[PDB]
Amino acid sequence: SNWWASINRKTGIRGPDPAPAEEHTNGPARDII
Amino acid sequence: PKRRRWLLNNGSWNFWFNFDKLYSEEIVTTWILESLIQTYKYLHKNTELLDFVTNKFITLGYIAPENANLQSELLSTKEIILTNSFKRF
Amino acid sequence: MDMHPEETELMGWRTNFKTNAAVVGDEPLGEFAHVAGLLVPLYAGRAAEVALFGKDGASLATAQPLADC
Amino acid sequence: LIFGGKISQLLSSKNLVKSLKQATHLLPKALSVLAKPMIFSDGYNNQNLKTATTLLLSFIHKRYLYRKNLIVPK
Amino acid sequence: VVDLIGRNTAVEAAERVRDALLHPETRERLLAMRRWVEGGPGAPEFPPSPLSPEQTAAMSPSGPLYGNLALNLDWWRRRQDNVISWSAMEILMSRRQVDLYKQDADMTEGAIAKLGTP
Amino acid sequence: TESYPAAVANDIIGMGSWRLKDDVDPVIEFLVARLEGCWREILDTDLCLYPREKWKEQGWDLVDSMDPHQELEGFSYADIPDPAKGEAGYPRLQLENRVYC
Amino acid sequence: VVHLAGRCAEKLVMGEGQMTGMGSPDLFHANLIAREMIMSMGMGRRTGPIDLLRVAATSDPFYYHTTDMSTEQARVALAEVVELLDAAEAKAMYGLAINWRALQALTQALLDRGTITGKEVAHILESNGVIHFPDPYTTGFGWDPDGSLRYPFKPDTTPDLSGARGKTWFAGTAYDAPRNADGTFKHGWHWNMPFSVKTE
Amino acid sequence: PDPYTTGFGWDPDGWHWNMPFSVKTELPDWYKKEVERYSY
Amino acid sequence: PDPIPPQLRRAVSVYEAGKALLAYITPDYEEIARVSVCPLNVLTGFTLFVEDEDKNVNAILTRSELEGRMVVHLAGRCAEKLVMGEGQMTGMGSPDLFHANLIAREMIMSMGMGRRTGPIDLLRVAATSDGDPFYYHTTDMSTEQARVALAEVV
């Protein structure tokens, strides 16, 4: 509900949803290949 | 063939489009420093393990720098030693 | 007149000698003063015209040495 | 992964200032920290530096994560 | 060669020569090395010790003290400033040199924002 | 490829990666090197590091008098200058421990 | 607007810091359109009708366009390009913000189906209550100097220095390293690290 | 005296160095405005 | 010194003598082969070193070794200053000054030996496939980074 009109390029652009998810690594090499 | 992109001479030396330099360098040095600090903080708490692995790696063998000429995978016994040292509890 | 081939290079640190109409006493000429003494013969062509005729007396005959000065 | 070896080299090196310097800002606690420690190896490999600088410059010159207007003179 | 080198350069040299003349040991060493450079029958062989007397040269052979020459070059770092200037002349030259010079610099109004602030 | 016996291996290692290896006396450093080398040589293939939850998770591997609460993440030995004479904290006591099984 | 839309959408959904580099070709394409409008087509208000781009690809840093105009005219033209990019980005964020529910439904549909057709896209967007653009122009859109959006219905047409952390080196002094809110040094720095930080 | 070659070990038989640094960088207002314009 | 002027011979003698002395007393340096000061009445002076194929070649360059090489390079002009005075120095020490400056810049910007610049690769060496047998790939730095690296080099 009008979550726009407060979108600031100087203080950071954020949506209404509080972050997508977490990040799973399981090792740098396993990320790589 | 003289240079014609003089922009700033009072306060700093800047030609016309060098605006992507301060941000670039202050990201590069910051990221490198953060990674080195993270590595130092990890290896600060595993110094006994470092000494143990070093002692067990001298006796297995290494390439001495005697310059008689003209290490990204690690051999099998040197991998067994390191996996045994990293057993923890 | 048996002379070193690089006598021009030796002319800086040599003392108490005389070449042409120029004498050098006990103080040797440095490299700076030795090479900076070459500017006067190159400027003398323009200086003669300026001293003897004026600014309008300056010609293209004395313009090439000024560009190497 | 790149810098672990140099970090262990720094952690396993004897500082020779406290073995070299003998007896205003005295004692070998403030006297030894007046200048850089005498690590034997020091420096970096110039290949690890090449990889790290290439990775970070490829991050900042190809993603435009924060400053997009820098694509203007591209 | 004063007109060739500039009055500012001549004044800086005069200040250096004055500072050397105020010290009798430095003045006598300078006179002796000038005599050796000129040569002749009056040359008193090699010039004296380069401001390191026999008590400071005997302070560190391979016997007493020693080990300070074993330290790395950073331990010989005699100048250290934590605020690095925006211009290379401030890093290179000393404060007196920048104050005497910098009217020869090819800059617009940086040459008032550089050392010896009025 | 050349290898060395465990005795000269531990002599090459010396004190090792000790956090306070530079402030210690040469006699203490020689003794620590000799005893740790004897451990790592004679008791090889069964020498474990002591469980970290007993001594290391409590921060007792390296304790500093001026930082008893580990507010500097174990970096107080170089983060904090030695106390002045009389000034609170003097004399500073630093203990490094190595526990094995 | 459409070419900035993808990176604006991923910035809104995944966050500012989790945006990947797949938006770089579209961002350069939007920049290319703005550059051709200002410096080639003569659509600049201040630049006006003059040809400034002289293609010198002729095929070290790989320049395609190449211009010989003065630094002041280059500053004005690139400022106009930047303001056009800002207007396009503002309109793209405005559209993605007013059609947030339809955007999320289309994202979930793309995740479920992999590929999708035009009719299914139209059906999803019309079933989720989409809002259309009355105009295809970015006129009036932009970013305010404070940082807020433009045309968002608003216009119309000391660090902690407690005990152990304070008993360190110089502390309250201009010679100290930068510190965080809790008193720890910046980047988790310490005084035995082989590098020196820069004072803030 | 060559270090790393002999000595340093028993045998029975003020100012820190990691000082944080700074650069002056007295930028003018037009340059700050250009930096702010392209810093987005 | 039949052709060669006395002050010129004294200058080159002082220079080559200081360079040879510092090369002799610098540890792990190349052995001096021949020190010539105007050998056949030719205005030149040099201090040669044996080109050994063992030892270093290209394995690892210690910072102590690089600092010793830089000190040996600066030794000739330091000897000229300390013997003849500040004003009697000439420009014969320019290749040695160039090599010392190259060593300092290499240590700061290629090996990350500076505490303030940090481990950043801003300079790389390359071999030319005549002049010098090598050139340098340079990274375009900003004024702040260039000033910090210049402060370290100075």
Side-chain angles (χ1 to χ4, degrees):
Chain A
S1 155
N2 243 7
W3 71 269
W4 60 298
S6 45
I7 297 193
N8 220 285
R9 74 201 291 220
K10 205 192 213 73
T11 84
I13 294 137
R14 278 147 302 168
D17 309 358
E22 78 158 13
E23 301 183 278
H24 202 10
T25 166
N26 313 69
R30 299 198 177 80
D31 292 334
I32 286 308
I33 48 184
Chain B
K2 277 178 54 54
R3 284 201 80 167
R4 58 213 289 117
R5 289 314 176 197
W6 301 83
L7 201 73
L8 183 47
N9 280 36
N10 179 26
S12 68
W13 285 89
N14 191 81
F15 273 64
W16 157 222
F17 223 106
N18 307 328
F19 297 114
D20 53 58
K21 246 175 213 191
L22 307 180
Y23 153 71
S24 312
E25 291 156 0
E26 290 326 290
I27 289 307
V28 161
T29 64
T30 282
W31 280 38
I32 275 189
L33 256 59
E34 284 201 350
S35 88
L36 276 152
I37 278 157
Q38 283 232 274
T39 316
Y40 208 107
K41 281 190 160 125
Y42 167 64
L43 273 190
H44 219 53
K45 329 270 174 274
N46 295 266
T47 43
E48 324 96 7
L49 171 153
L50 280 163
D51 294 338
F52 196 72
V53 171
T54 298
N55 158 247
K56 248 148 172 208
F57 273 26
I58 298 176
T59 74
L60 252 64
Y62 59 95
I63 296 291
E66 82 259 0
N67 257 334
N69 43 354
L70 258 294
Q71 211 74 50
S72 190
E73 230 153 277
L74 194 58
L75 291 172
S76 316
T77 173
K78 258 188 207 191
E79 201 265 330
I80 290 271
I81 316 185
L82 185 120
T83 48
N84 292 15
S85 89
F86 273 80
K87 196 101 183 99
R88 312 149 316 107
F89 279 122
Chain C
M1 60 95 77
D2 313 275
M3 219 166 41
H4 193 240
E6 295 156 75
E7 184 83 14
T8 317
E9 302 208 356
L10 305 187
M11 292 296 206
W13 293 274
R14 196 178 305 279
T15 58
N16 308 296
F17 72 95
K18 196 253 218 167
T19 41
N20 300 303
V23 76
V24 174
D26 260 333
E27 174 177 71
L29 310 141
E31 190 204 339
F32 177 74
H34 196 207
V35 187
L38 291 195
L39 302 179
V40 182
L42 304 180
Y43 274 143
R46 189 52 77 89
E49 262 165 350
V50 168
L52 271 83
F53 305 107
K55 170 63 183 316
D56 52 288
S59 57
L60 289 195
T62 80
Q64 326 285 336
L66 317 186
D68 294 275
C69 287
Chain D
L1 290 170
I2 284 172
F3 288 132
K6 186 61 206 331
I7 282 307
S8 67
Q9 267 191 347
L10 286 155
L11 267 177
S12 84
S13 273
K14 257 297 277 180
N15 200 358
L16 290 202
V17 292
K18 345 216 188 176
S19 312
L20 271 168
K21 289 210 58 65
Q22 291 161 359
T24 316
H25 314 137
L26 305 177
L27 300 154
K29 321 139 193 172
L31 199 58
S32 65
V33 300
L34 297 182
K36 196 136 193 202
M38 297 220 45
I39 303 311
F40 163 69
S41 45
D42 254 8
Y44 285 85
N45 204 30
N46 195 7
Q47 150 89 40
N48 307 338
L49 302 194
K50 262 221 235 170
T51 50
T53 41
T54 313
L55 179 53
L56 297 193
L57 281 169
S58 300
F59 178 79
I60 63 195
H61 290 351
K62 298 182 177 330
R63 207 197 259 225
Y64 312 98
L65 194 51
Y66 283 127
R67 337 275 200 84
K68 81 159 193 306
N69 290 329
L70 300 178
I71 210 159
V72 157
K74 237 67 179 202
Chain E
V1 283
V2 169
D3 50 337
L4 310 184
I5 63 147
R7 204 203 150 82
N8 270 342
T9 310
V11 162
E12 163 79 10
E15 290 176 8
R16 267 195 301 117
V17 164
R18 172 212 62 193
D19 267 22
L21 277 159
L22 261 53
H23 299 338
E25 288 98 9
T26 322
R27 177 182 76 245
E28 284 310 306
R29 177 182 169 251
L30 284 182
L31 291 165
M33 42 176 48
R34 189 55 206 163
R35 274 190 297 262
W36 183 77
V37 167
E38 280 179 354
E45 261 278 352
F46 221 68
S49 85
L51 305 179
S52 195
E54 202 29 75
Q55 91 89 357
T56 314
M59 222 187 54
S60 60
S62 304
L65 196 65
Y66 209 41
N68 286 30
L69 308 145
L71 299 157
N72 46 52
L73 267 194
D74 156 80
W75 271 88
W76 297 83
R77 177 221 40 212
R78 43 202 182 157
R79 40 143 277 152
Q80 191 240 6
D81 216 339
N82 315 281
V83 183
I84 296 152
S85 164
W86 66 274
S87 80
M89 150 164 47
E90 285 181 64
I91 310 171
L92 278 174
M93 329 176 137
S94 72
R95 164 72 62 108
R96 179 56 190 163
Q97 270 177 310
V98 173
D99 255 356
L100 217 38
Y101 309 143
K102 87 169 189 312
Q103 68 194 121
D104 297 77
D106 180 27
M107 310 195 257
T108 70
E109 289 91 33
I112 48 175
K114 274 152 51 44
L115 291 201
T117 291
Chain F
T1 310
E2 280 191 335
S3 95
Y4 277 103
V8 300
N10 296 125
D11 222 29
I12 283 170
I13 278 183
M15 191 89 159
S17 301
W18 278 66
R19 264 81 65 94
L20 316 175
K21 72 190 153 294
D22 296 309
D23 322 308
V24 289
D25 194 281
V27 184
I28 299 300
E29 182 171 3
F30 165 76
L31 270 169
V32 165
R34 274 300 191 275
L35 304 158
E36 222 182 24
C38 285
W39 286 351
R40 278 175 295 173
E41 165 184 357
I42 306 286
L43 299 179
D44 77 309
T45 68
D46 58 82
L47 199 77
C48 94
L49 186 60
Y50 210 75
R52 297 162 164 271
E53 61 262 11
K54 291 304 183 196
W55 65 292
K56 264 193 105 77
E57 280 188 355
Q58 331 199 47
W60 300 341
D61 52 335
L62 173 68
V63 296
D64 196 12
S65 77
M66 298 189 84
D67 182 27
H69 293 357
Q70 311 280 341
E71 293 151 68
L72 292 161
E73 301 120 26
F75 280 84
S76 38
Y77 71 100
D79 266 354
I80 291 184
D82 282 28
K85 286 200 69 216
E87 173 74 270
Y90 193 86
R92 178 150 84 141
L93 173 87
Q94 324 187 239
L95 296 144
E96 186 144 18
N97 306 303
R98 283 241 175 132
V99 193
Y100 292 100
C101 86
Chain G
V1 169
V2 167
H3 284 309
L4 295 182
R7 53 174 295 112
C8 286
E10 96 178 308
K11 193 197 306 191
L12 277 167
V13 175
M14 322 282 315
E16 237 287 342
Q18 285 91 84
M19 171 195 328
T20 77
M22 63 170 123
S24 291
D26 286 327
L27 171 63
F28 183 79
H29 199 216
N31 160 63
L32 194 78
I33 294 173
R35 176 145 83 218
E36 279 215 4
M37 284 181 12
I38 297 303
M39 287 138 92
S40 201
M41 286 134 184
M43 293 187 222
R45 189 202 40 175
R46 297 177 280 172
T47 297
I50 188 175
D51 187 42
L52 311 158
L53 293 183
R54 182 130 312 284
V55 172
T58 73
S59 302
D60 197 44
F62 184 21
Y63 290 132
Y64 168 80
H65 272 128
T66 290
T67 190
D68 48 1
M69 52 171 175
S70 55
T71 318
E72 181 54 47
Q73 297 168 42
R75 196 198 53 82
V76 169
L78 289 204
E80 291 208 303
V81 167
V82 157
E83 83 179 21
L84 275 185
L85 277 182
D86 283 22
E89 179 209 45
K91 188 173 198 195
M93 290 216 197
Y94 154 75
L96 287 155
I98 66 166
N99 296 299
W100 181 255
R101 188 177 78 208
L103 162 73
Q104 291 280 269
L106 194 46
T107 288
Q108 197 41 64
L110 267 181
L111 273 175
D112 288 1
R113 302 176 196 181
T115 174
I116 203 176
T117 76
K119 206 219 175 307
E120 319 194 272
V121 159
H123 182 61
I124 277 145
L125 294 176
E126 288 296 322
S127 300
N128 284 271
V130 69
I131 305 171
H132 287 267
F133 278 173
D135 266 1
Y137 303 95
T138 84
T139 311
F141 284 97
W143 290 100
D144 279 12
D146 54 85
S148 315
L149 192 143
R150 198 168 337 138
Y151 261 34
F153 205 55
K154 151 194 70 65
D156 214 317
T157 323
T158 165
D160 157 80
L161 226 59
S162 41
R165 300 243 182 78
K167 275 137 56 77
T168 65
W169 292 98
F170 310 100
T173 314
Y175 296 111
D176 202 18
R179 296 174 182 261
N180 273 318
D182 44 5
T184 48
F185 294 111
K186 268 283 186 332
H187 315 322
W189 191 71
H190 287 295
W191 283 85
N192 54 333
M193 311 287 204
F195 30 76
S196 307
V197 282
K198 215 193 302 189
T199 79
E200 270 157 13
Chain H
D2 187 23
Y4 311 129
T5 207
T6 289
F8 312 136
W10 195 66
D11 193 64
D13 206 37
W15 279 75
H16 207 253
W17 66 274
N18 234 358
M19 291 285 327
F21 66 100
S22 66
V23 199
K24 290 217 170 202
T25 280
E26 308 96 325
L27 300 180
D29 72 337
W30 56 269
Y31 192 80
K32 280 167 198 154
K33 159 177 77 50
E34 289 299 315
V35 155
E36 196 246 317
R37 168 191 316 280
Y38 292 102
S39 292
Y40 281 121
Chain I
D2 220 307
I4 301 315
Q7 309 208 14
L8 174 63
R9 190 159 289 270
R10 284 192 203 97
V12 188
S13 305
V14 165
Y15 187 98
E16 307 300 332
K19 190 203 262 212
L21 170 79
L22 259 303
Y24 185 74
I25 70 168
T26 287
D28 312 331
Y29 208 76
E30 293 104 334
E31 285 185 349
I32 316 156
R34 198 159 40 83
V35 176
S36 308
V37 173
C38 305
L40 316 168
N41 303 327
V42 178
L43 209 154
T44 186
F46 43 89
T47 295
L48 309 181
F49 301 95
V50 290
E51 311 175 4
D52 55 338
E53 74 266 17
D54 40 45
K55 290 174 177 71
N56 170 53
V57 198
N58 186 33
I60 169 179
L61 272 175
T62 325
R63 68 154 326 150
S64 74
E65 165 175 346
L66 296 152
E67 287 158 358
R69 289 197 179 275
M70 161 189 342
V71 162
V72 167
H73 281 314
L74 290 192
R77 68 194 317 272
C78 282
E80 247 189 326
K81 279 156 76 177
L82 277 192
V83 181
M84 323 213 89
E86 186 52 78
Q88 307 302 313
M89 209 191 348
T90 167
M92 30 177 314
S94 292
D96 289 283
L97 177 72
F98 205 107
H99 278 74
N101 278 248
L102 248 192
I103 288 159
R105 267 158 179 85
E106 189 75 14
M107 292 170 34
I108 295 306
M109 321 189 23
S110 100
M111 306 157 174
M113 264 150 215
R115 59 182 195 86
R116 298 173 274 207
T117 310
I120 316 295
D121 172 56
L122 308 149
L123 198 79
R124 298 153 294 277
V125 84
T128 51
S129 320
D130 279 343
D132 41 326
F134 68 112
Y135 70 96
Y136 272 97
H137 289 290
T138 64
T139 291
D140 293 324
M141 335 157 64
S142 66
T143 313
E144 289 87 340
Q145 204 173 42
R147 280 326 176 236
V148 170
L150 177 61
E152 297 169 42
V153 163
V154 161

PDB file of all heavy atoms in Angstrom, chain C residues 4 6 9-10 13-14 28 31, chain I residues 3-5 7-8 41 43 90:
ATOM      1  N   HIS C   4      92.646  14.548 -27.403  1.00  0.00           N
ATOM      2  CA  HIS C   4      91.697  13.475 -27.163  1.00  0.00           C
ATOM      3  C   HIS C   4      90.500  13.637 -28.099  1.00  0.00           C
ATOM      4  O   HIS C   4      90.099  14.770 -28.391  1.00  0.00           O
ATOM      5  CB  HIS C   4      91.250  13.512 -25.701  1.00  0.00           C
ATOM      6  CG  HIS C   4      90.528  12.283 -25.248  1.00  0.00           C
ATOM      7  ND1 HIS C   4      89.238  12.317 -24.767  1.00  0.00           N
ATOM      8  CD2 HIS C   4      90.923  10.991 -25.180  1.00  0.00           C
ATOM      9  CE1 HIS C   4      88.863  11.095 -24.436  1.00  0.00           C
ATOM     10  NE2 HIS C   4      89.864  10.271 -24.682  1.00  0.00           N
ATOM     11  N   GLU C   6      87.407  12.884 -27.450  1.00  0.00           N
ATOM     12  CA  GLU C   6      86.340  13.396 -26.603  1.00  0.00           C
ATOM     13  C   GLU C   6      86.777  14.622 -25.832  1.00  0.00           C
ATOM     14  O   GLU C   6      86.363  14.815 -24.676  1.00  0.00           O
ATOM     15  CB  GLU C   6      85.852  12.305 -25.654  1.00  0.00           C
ATOM     16  CG  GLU C   6      85.207  11.137 -26.365  1.00  0.00           C
ATOM     17  CD  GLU C   6      85.250   9.873 -25.540  1.00  0.00           C
ATOM     18  OE1 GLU C   6      84.470   9.774 -24.574  1.00  0.00           O
ATOM     19  OE2 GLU C   6      86.064   8.980 -25.855  1.00  0.00           O
ATOM     20  N   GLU C   9      84.061  16.646 -24.385  1.00  0.00           N
ATOM     21  CA  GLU C   9      83.609  16.156 -23.088  1.00  0.00           C
ATOM     22  C   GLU C   9      84.615  16.466 -21.987  1.00  0.00           C
ATOM     23  O   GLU C   9      84.221  16.724 -20.844  1.00  0.00           O
ATOM     24  CB  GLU C   9      83.347  14.655 -23.157  1.00  0.00           C
ATOM     25  CG  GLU C   9      82.325  14.251 -24.186  1.00  0.00           C
ATOM     26  CD  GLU C   9      81.600  12.971 -23.822  1.00  0.00           C
ATOM     27  OE1 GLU C   9      81.950  12.357 -22.792  1.00  0.00           O
ATOM     28  OE2 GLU C   9      80.678  12.576 -24.567  1.00  0.00           O
ATOM     29  N   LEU C  10      85.912  16.442 -22.306  1.00  0.00           N
ATOM     30  CA  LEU C  10      86.939  16.786 -21.330  1.00  0.00           C
ATOM     31  C   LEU C  10      86.980  18.276 -21.019  1.00  0.00           C
ATOM     32  O   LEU C  10      87.631  18.660 -20.040  1.00  0.00           O
ATOM     33  CB  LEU C  10      88.325  16.357 -21.821  1.00  0.00           C
ATOM     34  CG  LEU C  10      88.590  14.911 -22.232  1.00  0.00           C
ATOM     35  CD1 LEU C  10      90.062  14.721 -22.502  1.00  0.00           C
ATOM     36  CD2 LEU C  10      88.140  13.963 -21.167  1.00  0.00           C
ATOM     37  N   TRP C  13      85.732  19.661 -17.136  1.00  0.00           N
ATOM     38  CA  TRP C  13      86.524  19.543 -15.921  1.00  0.00           C
ATOM     39  C   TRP C  13      87.965  20.008 -16.086  1.00  0.00           C
ATOM     40  O   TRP C  13      88.702  20.040 -15.097  1.00  0.00           O
ATOM     41  CB  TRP C  13      86.491  18.096 -15.426  1.00  0.00           C
ATOM     42  CG  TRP C  13      85.131  17.695 -14.962  1.00  0.00           C
ATOM     43  CD1 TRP C  13      84.599  17.889 -13.722  1.00  0.00           C
ATOM     44  CD2 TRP C  13      84.113  17.055 -15.740  1.00  0.00           C
ATOM     45  NE1 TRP C  13      83.318  17.398 -13.675  1.00  0.00           N
ATOM     46  CE2 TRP C  13      82.995  16.881 -14.902  1.00  0.00           C
ATOM     47  CE3 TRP C  13      84.041  16.607 -17.063  1.00  0.00           C
ATOM     48  CZ2 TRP C  13      81.819  16.277 -15.342  1.00  0.00           C
ATOM     49  CZ3 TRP C  13      82.873  16.007 -17.498  1.00  0.00           C
ATOM     50  CH2 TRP C  13      81.777  15.849 -16.640  1.00  0.00           C
ATOM     51  N   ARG C  14      88.386  20.368 -17.296  1.00  0.00           N
ATOM     52  CA  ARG C  14      89.714  20.937 -17.472  1.00  0.00           C
ATOM     53  C   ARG C  14      89.744  22.371 -16.961  1.00  0.00           C
ATOM     54  O   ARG C  14      88.775  23.120 -17.104  1.00  0.00           O
ATOM     55  CB  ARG C  14      90.130  20.894 -18.942  1.00  0.00           C
ATOM     56  CG  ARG C  14      91.623  21.097 -19.154  1.00  0.00           C
ATOM     57  CD  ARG C  14      92.003  21.010 -20.619  1.00  0.00           C
ATOM     58  NE  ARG C  14      91.560  19.759 -21.222  1.00  0.00           N
ATOM     59  CZ  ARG C  14      92.205  18.607 -21.116  1.00  0.00           C
ATOM     60  NH1 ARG C  14      93.330  18.504 -20.427  1.00  0.00           N
ATOM     61  NH2 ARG C  14      91.711  17.530 -21.717  1.00  0.00           N
ATOM     62  N   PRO C  28      86.584  24.793 -12.601  1.00  0.00           N
ATOM     63  CA  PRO C  28      86.080  24.100 -13.790  1.00  0.00           C
ATOM     64  C   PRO C  28      84.609  24.395 -14.027  1.00  0.00           C
ATOM     65  O   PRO C  28      83.855  24.738 -13.114  1.00  0.00           O
ATOM     66  CB  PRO C  28      86.300  22.622 -13.458  1.00  0.00           C
ATOM     67  CG  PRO C  28      86.228  22.570 -11.973  1.00  0.00           C
ATOM     68  CD  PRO C  28      86.814  23.868 -11.478  1.00  0.00           C
ATOM     69  N   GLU C  31      78.844  20.305 -15.774  1.00  0.00           N
ATOM     70  CA  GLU C  31      78.056  19.888 -16.929  1.00  0.00           C
ATOM     71  C   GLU C  31      76.924  20.871 -17.197  1.00  0.00           C
ATOM     72  O   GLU C  31      76.632  21.186 -18.357  1.00  0.00           O
ATOM     73  CB  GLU C  31      77.505  18.480 -16.721  1.00  0.00           C
ATOM     74  CG  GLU C  31      76.887  17.887 -17.973  1.00  0.00           C
ATOM     75  CD  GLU C  31      75.874  16.807 -17.666  1.00  0.00           C
ATOM     76  OE1 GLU C  31      75.925  16.241 -16.555  1.00  0.00           O
ATOM     77  OE2 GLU C  31      75.025  16.527 -18.536  1.00  0.00           O
TER      78      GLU C  31
ATOM     79  N   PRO I   3      95.349  12.402 -20.926  1.00  0.00           N
ATOM     80  CA  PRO I   3      94.243  13.236 -21.424  1.00  0.00           C
ATOM     81  C   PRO I   3      93.227  13.634 -20.355  1.00  0.00           C
ATOM     82  O   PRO I   3      92.948  14.825 -20.192  1.00  0.00           O
ATOM     83  CB  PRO I   3      93.616  12.371 -22.524  1.00  0.00           C
ATOM     84  CG  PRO I   3      93.875  11.004 -22.116  1.00  0.00           C
ATOM     85  CD  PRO I   3      95.143  10.987 -21.315  1.00  0.00           C
ATOM     86  N   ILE I   4      92.706  12.653 -19.615  1.00  0.00           N
ATOM     87  CA  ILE I   4      91.601  12.795 -18.664  1.00  0.00           C
ATOM     88  C   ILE I   4      91.921  13.842 -17.606  1.00  0.00           C
ATOM     89  O   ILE I   4      92.978  13.764 -16.963  1.00  0.00           O
ATOM     90  CB  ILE I   4      91.269  11.443 -18.005  1.00  0.00           C
ATOM     91  CG1 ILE I   4      90.873  10.384 -19.040  1.00  0.00           C
ATOM     92  CG2 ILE I   4      90.176  11.595 -16.960  1.00  0.00           C
ATOM     93  CD1 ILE I   4      89.899  10.872 -20.094  1.00  0.00           C
ATOM     94  N   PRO I   5      91.058  14.841 -17.415  1.00  0.00           N
ATOM     95  CA  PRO I   5      91.312  15.880 -16.415  1.00  0.00           C
ATOM     96  C   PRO I   5      91.338  15.306 -15.011  1.00  0.00           C
ATOM     97  O   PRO I   5      90.682  14.288 -14.733  1.00  0.00           O
ATOM     98  CB  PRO I   5      90.131  16.845 -16.602  1.00  0.00           C
ATOM     99  CG  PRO I   5      89.683  16.618 -17.996  1.00  0.00           C
ATOM    100  CD  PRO I   5      89.867  15.148 -18.221  1.00  0.00           C
ATOM    101  N   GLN I   7      90.100  16.358 -12.068  1.00  0.00           N
ATOM    102  CA  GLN I   7      88.840  16.354 -11.332  1.00  0.00           C
ATOM    103  C   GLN I   7      87.861  15.334 -11.899  1.00  0.00           C
ATOM    104  O   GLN I   7      87.115  14.706 -11.138  1.00  0.00           O
ATOM    105  CB  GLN I   7      88.231  17.758 -11.330  1.00  0.00           C
ATOM    106  CG  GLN I   7      89.208  18.839 -10.886  1.00  0.00           C
ATOM    107  CD  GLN I   7      88.526  20.029 -10.240  1.00  0.00           C
ATOM    108  OE1 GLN I   7      87.352  19.965  -9.875  1.00  0.00           O
ATOM    109  NE2 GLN I   7      89.261  21.125 -10.093  1.00  0.00           N
ATOM    110  N   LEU I   8      87.869  15.135 -13.220  1.00  0.00           N
ATOM    111  CA  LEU I   8      87.048  14.088 -13.822  1.00  0.00           C
ATOM    112  C   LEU I   8      87.497  12.701 -13.380  1.00  0.00           C
ATOM    113  O   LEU I   8      86.660  11.847 -13.048  1.00  0.00           O
ATOM    114  CB  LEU I   8      87.096  14.203 -15.344  1.00  0.00           C
ATOM    115  CG  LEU I   8      86.395  13.091 -16.122  1.00  0.00           C
ATOM    116  CD1 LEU I   8      84.906  13.080 -15.817  1.00  0.00           C
ATOM    117  CD2 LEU I   8      86.645  13.259 -17.605  1.00  0.00           C
ATOM    118  N   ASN I  41      91.858   5.619 -22.005  1.00  0.00           N
ATOM    119  CA  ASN I  41      91.623   7.053 -22.168  1.00  0.00           C
ATOM    120  C   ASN I  41      90.256   7.348 -22.773  1.00  0.00           C
ATOM    121  O   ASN I  41      90.055   8.402 -23.376  1.00  0.00           O
ATOM    122  CB  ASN I  41      92.728   7.715 -23.000  1.00  0.00           C
ATOM    123  CG  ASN I  41      94.104   7.510 -22.402  1.00  0.00           C
ATOM    124  OD1 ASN I  41      94.262   7.450 -21.184  1.00  0.00           O
ATOM    125  ND2 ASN I  41      95.111   7.403 -23.261  1.00  0.00           N
ATOM    126  N   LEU I  43      86.316   8.122 -22.119  1.00  0.00           N
ATOM    127  CA  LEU I  43      85.551   8.696 -21.021  1.00  0.00           C
ATOM    128  C   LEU I  43      84.405   7.772 -20.633  1.00  0.00           C
ATOM    129  O   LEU I  43      83.276   7.930 -21.107  1.00  0.00           O
ATOM    130  CB  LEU I  43      85.021  10.081 -21.392  1.00  0.00           C
ATOM    131  CG  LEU I  43      84.812  11.074 -20.248  1.00  0.00           C
ATOM    132  CD1 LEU I  43      84.911  12.465 -20.771  1.00  0.00           C
ATOM    133  CD2 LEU I  43      83.462  10.898 -19.621  1.00  0.00           C
ATOM    134  N   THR I  90      77.852  14.868 -10.511  1.00  0.00           N
ATOM    135  CA  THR I  90      77.372  14.973 -11.882  1.00  0.00           C
ATOM    136  C   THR I  90      76.370  13.853 -12.163  1.00  0.00           C
ATOM    137  O   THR I  90      75.996  13.085 -11.273  1.00  0.00           O
ATOM    138  CB  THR I  90      78.547  14.976 -12.864  1.00  0.00           C
ATOM    139  OG1 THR I  90      78.067  14.776 -14.200  1.00  0.00           O
ATOM    140  CG2 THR I  90      79.566  13.934 -12.499  1.00  0.00           C
TER     141      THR I  90
END
